Amino acid sequence: HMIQAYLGLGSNIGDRESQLNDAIKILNEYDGISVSNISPIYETAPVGYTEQPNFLNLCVEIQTTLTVLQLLECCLKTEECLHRIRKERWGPRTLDVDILLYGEEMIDLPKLSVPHPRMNERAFVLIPLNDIAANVVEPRSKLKVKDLVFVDDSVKRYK
Numbered sequence: 070h071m072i073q074a075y076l077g078l079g080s081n082i083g084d085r086e087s088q089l090n091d092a093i094k095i096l097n098e099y100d101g102i103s104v105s106n107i108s109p110i111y112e113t114a115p116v117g118y119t120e121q122p123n124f125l126n127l128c129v130e131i132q133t134t135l136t137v138l139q140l141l142e143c144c145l146k147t148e149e150c151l152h153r154i155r156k157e158r159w160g161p162r163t164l165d166v167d168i169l170l171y172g173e174e175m176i177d178l179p180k181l182s183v184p185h186p187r188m189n190e191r192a193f194v195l196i197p198l199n200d201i202a203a204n205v206v207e208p209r210s211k212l213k214v215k216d217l218v219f220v221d222d223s224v225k226r227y228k
């Protein structure tokens with residue numbers, strides 16, 4: 070039995086589009102993960118620390134038989150495969166893979182919160198997520214993504 074989950078991907082170092090497309094390929098290669106939907110890519114001004122490069126961001130849907138922790142380990146392993154060496158949470162990275170949603174399940178462990186607890190105020194997440202998951206309910210707010218998404222000029226259609 071598979072569950073539907075959503076991942077947020079980001080890159081702001083180097084050939085960002087290549088790193089994102091390699092990430093999707095690698096995610097689809099883990100036993101127990103199948104990438105089932107892919108959003109458009111957006112180019113986005115960096116949020117937080119601004120003296121760093123512009124990001125490309127997208128979202129994917131996966132069908133997975135993995136538990137949430139097994140899925141997290143696959144996300145981190147993918148970052149390692151793309152040579153994410155920097156680990157300053159505020160700083161640049163070759164690849165970031167974040168778990169956004171895992172069905173309607175909710176957890177807030179010290180080091181793992183799903184739904185991702187910052188997604189609802191990030192246009193760099195909600196805009197691509199709405200492209201693939203408009204009618205999906207975000208279980209904290211209990212609102213559909215299409216009712217969370219908002220306009221943001223710092224998020225531009227890329228490609």
Ligand SMILES: Nc1ncnc2c1ncn2[C@@H]1O[C@H](COP(=O)(O)CP(=O)(O)OP(=O)(O)O)[C@@H](O)[C@H]1O
Pocket residue numbers: 144156157158159165166167168169180181182183184185186187
């Ligand atoms: N839903 C989630 N997805 C991925 N990582 C999560 C997570 N909730 C908590 N984390 C934690 O965040 C840790 C550090 O990961 P980083 O990728 O450097 C943070 P970031 O992606 O820059 O910020 P963000 O998670 O606010 O987007 C992970 O090892 C994990 O323990």
Ligand SMILES: Nc1nc2[nH]c(SCC(=O)c3ccc(-c4ccccc4)cc3)nc2c(=O)[nH]1
Pocket residue numbers: 078079080113114115116117118124126158159160165193
């Ligand atoms: N557009 C864009 N900006 C990004 N900044 C980063 S650094 C980690 C982070 O998410 C982050 C996001 C937001 C704050 C913040 C912190 C405090 C106050 C306001 C914002 C910090 C870090 N990742 C991306 C990305 O993927 N896209």
Ligand SMILES: [Mg+2]
Pocket residue numbers: 079165166167
């Ligand atoms: Mg992140």
Ligand SMILES: [Mg+2]
Pocket residue numbers: 165166167
């Ligand atoms: Mg991350």
